[PDB]
Amino acid sequence: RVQSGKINCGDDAGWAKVPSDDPGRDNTRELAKNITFASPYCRPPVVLLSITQLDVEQSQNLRVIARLYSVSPTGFKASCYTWHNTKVYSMSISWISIEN
Amino acid sequence: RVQSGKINCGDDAGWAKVPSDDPGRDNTRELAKNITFASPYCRPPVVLLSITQLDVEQSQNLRVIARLYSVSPTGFKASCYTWHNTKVYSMSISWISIEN
Amino acid sequence: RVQSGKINCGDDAGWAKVPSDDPGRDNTRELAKNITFASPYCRPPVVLLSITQLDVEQSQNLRVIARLYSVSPTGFKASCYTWHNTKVYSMSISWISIEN
Amino acid sequence: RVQSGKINCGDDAGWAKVPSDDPGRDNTRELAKNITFASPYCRPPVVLLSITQLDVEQSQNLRVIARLYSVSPTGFKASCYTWHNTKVYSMSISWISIEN
Amino acid sequence: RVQSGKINCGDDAGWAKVPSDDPGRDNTRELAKNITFASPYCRPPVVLLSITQLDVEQSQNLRVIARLYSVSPTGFKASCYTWHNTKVYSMSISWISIEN
Amino acid sequence: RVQSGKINCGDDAGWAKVPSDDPGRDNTRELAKNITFASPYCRPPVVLLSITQLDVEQSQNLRVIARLYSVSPTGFKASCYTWHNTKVYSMSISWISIEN
Ligand SMILES: CC(=O)N[C@@H]1[C@@H](O[C@H]2O[C@H](CO)[C@H](O)[C@H](O)[C@H]2NC(C)=O)[C@@H](O)[C@@H](CO)O[C@H]1O
Ligand SMILES: CC(=O)N[C@@H]1[C@@H](O[C@H]2O[C@H](CO)[C@H](O)[C@H](O)[C@H]2NC(C)=O)[C@@H](O)[C@@H](CO)O[C@H]1O
Ligand SMILES: CC(=O)N[C@@H]1[C@@H](O[C@H]2O[C@H](CO)[C@H](O)[C@H](O)[C@H]2NC(C)=O)[C@@H](O)[C@@H](CO)O[C@H]1O
Ligand SMILES: CC(=O)N[C@@H]1[C@@H](O[C@H]2O[C@H](CO)[C@H](O)[C@H](O)[C@H]2NC(C)=O)[C@@H](O)[C@@H](CO)O[C@H]1O
Ligand SMILES: CC(=O)N[C@@H]1[C@@H](O[C@H]2O[C@H](CO)[C@H](O)[C@H](O)[C@H]2NC(C)=O)[C@@H](O)[C@@H](CO)O[C@H]1O
Ligand SMILES: CC(=O)N[C@@H]1[C@@H](O[C@H]2O[C@H](CO)[C@H](O)[C@H](O)[C@H]2NC(C)=O)[C@@H](O)[C@@H](CO)O[C@H]1O
Ligand SMILES: *[C@@H]1O[C@H](CO)[C@@H](O)[C@H](O)[C@H]1NC(C)=O
Ligand SMILES: *[C@@H]1O[C@H](CO)[C@@H](O)[C@H](O)[C@H]1NC(C)=O
Ligand SMILES: *[C@@H]1O[C@H](CO)[C@@H](O)[C@H](O)[C@H]1NC(C)=O
Ligand SMILES: *[C@@H]1O[C@H](CO)[C@@H](O)[C@H](O)[C@H]1NC(C)=O
Ligand SMILES: *[C@@H]1O[C@H](CO)[C@@H](O)[C@H](O)[C@H]1NC(C)=O
Ligand SMILES: *[C@@H]1O[C@H](CO)[C@@H](O)[C@H](O)[C@H]1NC(C)=O
């Protein structure tokens, strides 16, 4: 089975401050959603992430990641991620999950 | 079967004005292509969209969507989408279609 | 089998100057990696590219491509690609490869 | 999808006389069932037949066929088939259907 | 994944007497093996049975079944089965297991 | 891909004498065909054999095998096989080949 979805992170005011894991980045924020597959897999599927909606402040550098932390048979943790003075007004991440 | 392609939307001068479906957005334009699978499916495939070419005006906010309206067994309607004063000089959307 | 990976291109100082293949573009640079599938295919798989990390200079236009040159049963050549005065500080391309 | 089933033809007293299509065979009888897949295919699946229950008269030659006439996306016509003076007391045909 | 194997039941002297579950059959014997898939499934696969070696006494009726009791994600119970005065000197059952 | 076919061995007069590989069998004959897949595989497929047509002399013991020697990506050697005084007038072996 193959499943797909869409993660609307929205404004980064609702995103949480998280502690940087890259020493050259600070003020790292992150909308980290925790997804559950409608129809579970029993072996962890391969997941691809895609950014398909961006609304970023022009006066300041575009800093975004569509981050993919982990993948289990039941679901996956992924996030919209930005850092420093960059301002995200909108970020969506559509994704896919395939067996093997 | 799995099929893939690429939608080159180009300059947004050729994109059409379309009526906003989000009340906080205006001047919504859209290059909405209508794709047909080379080898048809008989059940609608799962489609993922990806943005893989961006050329956007720096003086004004990055506003883009790789929108996916609908998916049939024969094809799918999807679009490059921008709004307000944002200026897109170039947007490509490469995509994939898998069975299930 | 389905395989996935991630290409971190990094700063465009390490990207090479390459000769433009589009007459309206100049100063075309490119981090062109050459990937090898862990478990080979015997027929060329369908590959999708996705941009999942961008860090671009705000004072100058966003110009990027996640380019996909060729796909063999053994691997594929793809690249982060920018042109003119645009400055990329960071670009990642996560990808997927499926049979057929 | 893959589907399987089982056709119990039973005693050949209930099998019909049918006209021989092989000139070296006569008294050709046949229990010809007409199967319908639970979950339809949209392209005709590959079907394999197997004989998995035989109960044949010892005094006379073993003459049986697990015949596979046709395969559609909706189902298939197949039959237990015997000829001449052979006496079948019992014949089952378990089968399988796979996509492609 | 698809797995296959082969069950050599051998002479029916080693087959066990089992109590008939069909009132018109007696002296029912059965070589009932209990198979384990090399690489487990997590949903029960579709299994087909095939008889591919028979060595039966000519003086007495051919009575055999390639019986398929149950199928789990881990394996399946199946058997060579004969009844009454029939004498099996040799019966093999080759089988296949496919996902879905 | 999945492929299927059918091997009609016919009368055992055309079958060759071959040297027994089982010390308890003699006068071993064999119609050993050498099959080639229409659309090659690049890894050896799993093959199942099935006997689906038998026409055997009643006065003498039923001795048959649907033998499967080897499987390559290009095809497979399999055979109708009988031994001792058994007389086969007709044996067909329908088969299937699936990827993995
Ligand atoms: C190019 C550069 O290093 N500019 C610094 C700026 O660094 C921040 O922005 C750059 C690229 O725009 C990278 O994203 C860095 O990761 C990021 N650093 C941090 C700690 O977030 C800052 O150092 C800024 C404030 O000192 O000075 C700029 O000139
Ligand atoms: C942050 C904000 O609301 N700025 C407004 C601007 O809103 C437009 O741009 C923002 C983010 O850049 C969103 O994309 C909105 O969807 C968009 N609104 C519309 C109607 O297109 C405009 O309201 C602008 C003109 O009044 O004022 C800015 O300050
Ligand atoms: C909109 C435009 O053509 N501006 C030109 C600029 O063209 C460059 O940037 C645009 C969009 O930002 C395209 O990406 C072009 O491909 C790119 N051209 C080249 C040759 O790289 C330059 O021509 C610039 C210098 O003459 O003038 C701008 O006004
Ligand atoms: C060996 C033979 O031809 N015996 C014939 C018998 O033929 C019948 O049985 C054989 C094998 O057992 C084949 O199955 C033939 O297809 C079948 N023929 C028919 C018409 O059904 C009969 O011809 C029989 C009656 O004349 O004579 C036997 O000796
Ligand atoms: C044709 C028939 O019923 N013959 C009976 C025989 O029945 C046995 O064999 C037949 C077919 O060969 C079926 O397999 C039956 O299932 C089987 N019955 C049993 C109880 O095993 C016996 O009844 C036999 C002894 O009374 O008489 C034959 O004539
Ligand atoms: C039951 C038995 O061993 N009978 C023998 C017979 O053996 C042949 O037939 C049996 C079963 O019907 C097996 O198929 C053996 O494999 C087969 N042996 C050979 C060498 O082909 C013969 O030994 C026969 C001639 O001596 O005597 C029977 O009683
Ligand atoms: C979902 O995300 C949170 C935030 O990181 C994490 O701590 C939690 O364990 C996750 N929940 C699940 C379903 O695993
Ligand atoms: C393709 O797109 C247009 C524009 O929205 C739509 O109206 C039309 O029905 C579509 N054509 C097909 C092939 O369905
Ligand atoms: C990898 O990329 C380089 C740069 O274009 C190319 O010339 C080379 O042939 C490629 N190597 C492989 C493994 O094909
Ligand atoms: C089923 O079998 C009969 C007997 O041959 C045939 O005539 C009929 O058309 C079949 N029905 C279907 C469902 O096609
Ligand atoms: C295998 O077969 C025996 C005999 O019927 C059965 O009782 C036993 O539970 C089976 N073992 C497994 C692995 O389930
Ligand atoms: C086919 O069968 C013959 C007989 O055993 C064998 O010797 C030969 O090598 C086979 N041919 C192919 C195509 O491998």
* CA–CA distance, A78 with A92 (Å, rounded to integer): 12
Fold type of domain E1-100: Immunoglobulin-like (2.60.40)
Q: Which of A78, A75, A82, A41 is nearest to A61 (CA)?
A: A82
* CA–CA distance, A93 with A86 (Å, rounded to integer): 18
Residue indicated by tokens 């959603």: A33
- Non-local (6+) Cβ contacts of B24 within 8 A are none
Annotated resolution, angstroms: 2.8
CA B9 to chain centre: 8
User: Is A65's Cβ below 8 Å from some Cβ in C?
Assistant: yes
Q: DSSP letter for C44, please.
A: P
* Cβ atoms of residues E93 and E26 within 8 Å: no
* CA–CA distance, B48 with A50 (Å, rounded to integer): 8
* CA–CA distance, C10 with E57 (Å, rounded to integer): 77
* Cβ atoms of residues D41 and D97 within 8 Å: yes
* Cβ atoms of residues E55 and E87 within 8 Å: no
Residues of E in contact with F7 (CB under 8 A): none
The side-by-side arrangement of strands in the sheet containing F29-36 is E2-8, E88-98, E46-56, F62-71, F75-82, F29-36, F16-17
Kind plus residue range of the DSSP H or E element containing B87: none
* Residue nearest ligand 1's atom 20 by CA: A25
* CA–CA distance, B57 with E29 (Å, rounded to integer): 83
The side-by-side arrangement of strands in the sheet containing E16-17 is D2-8, D88-98, D46-56, E62-71, E75-82, E29-36, E16-17
Question: Domain coordinates of chain A in residue numbers?
Answer: 1-100
Ordered DSSP codes for D32-66: EEEEE-SS--SSPPEEEEEEEEEEE-TTS-EEEEE
Other residues' Cβ atoms within 10 Å of the Cβ of residue F99: 15
**Ligand-binding site membership of C63 (annotated):** yes
Could you tell me which residues are beta bridge partners of residue B90?
A: B55
Q: Is the dihedral of CA B4, B91, C74, C4 positive or negative?
A: negative
Contacts by residues C67-73 (CB-CB < 8 Å, ≥ 24 positions apart): C67/B52, C67/C30, C67/C32, C68/B52, C68/B94, C69/C32, C71/C44, C71/C45, C71/C46, C71/C47, C72/C44, C73/C40, C73/C41, C73/C42, C73/C43, C73/C44, C73/C45
The side-by-side arrangement of strands in the sheet containing A2-8 is A2-8, A88-98, A46-56, B62-71, B75-82, B29-36, B16-17
* Cβ atoms of residues B75 and B41 within 8 Å: no
Q: Which of F26, F85, F90, F25 is nearest to F54 (CA)?
A: F90
Kind plus residue range of the DSSP H or E element containing E21: none
Name the phi and psi angles at B36, rounded to 5: -125, 120
Other residues' Cβ atoms within 10 Å of the Cβ of residue C87: 17
A51 and C52: CB-CB below 8 Å?
Answer: yes
User: Is B100's Cβ below 8 Å from some Cβ in A?
Assistant: yes
CA angle D98, F52, F14 (to 5 degrees): 130
Find the radius of gyration of the CA atoms of chain F. Answer: 14
* E67-83 burial: b if 16+ Cβ within 10 Å, else e: bbeebeeebbebbbbbb
- Non-local (6+) Cβ contacts of E13 within 8 A are none
Could you tell me which residues are beta bridge partners of residue F49?
A: F95
* Cβ atoms of residues E94 and E3 within 8 Å: no
* CA–CA distance, F89 with F31 (Å, rounded to integer): 12
Residues of A in contact with B61 (CB under 8 A): 55-58, 89
The upper half-sphere exposure of residue F9, i.e. CA atoms within 13 Å in the direction of its Cβ, equals: 34
* CA–CA distance, C8 with C17 (Å, rounded to integer): 18
Q: Which conformational region is residue B89 in: left (phi greater than 0), alpha (psi within -120 to 50 degrees), or beta?
A: alpha
* Cβ atoms of residues E95 and F95 within 8 Å: no
* Cβ atoms of residues D3 and D95 within 8 Å: no
H, E, C per residue of A32-100: EEEEECCCCCCCCCEEEEEEEEEEECCCCCEEEEEEEEEECCCEEEEEEEECCCCCEEEEEEEEEEECC
Other residues' Cβ atoms within 10 Å of the Cβ of residue F39: 8
Q: Is the dihedral of CA E37, E39, E42, E47 positive or negative?
A: negative
Q: Which of F6, F85, F62, E20 is nearest to D54 (CA)?
A: F62
User: Is A43's Cβ below 8 Å from some Cβ in E?
Assistant: yes
Q: Where are the beta strands (DSSP E) in C1-100?
A: 2-8, 16-17, 29-36, 46-56, 62-71, 75-82, 88-98
E23 lines ligand 5 (CB under 6 A): no
Q: How far is A65 from chain C (nearest CA, A)?
A: 4
Q: Do chains F and A touch (3 or more CB pairs under 8 A)?
A: no
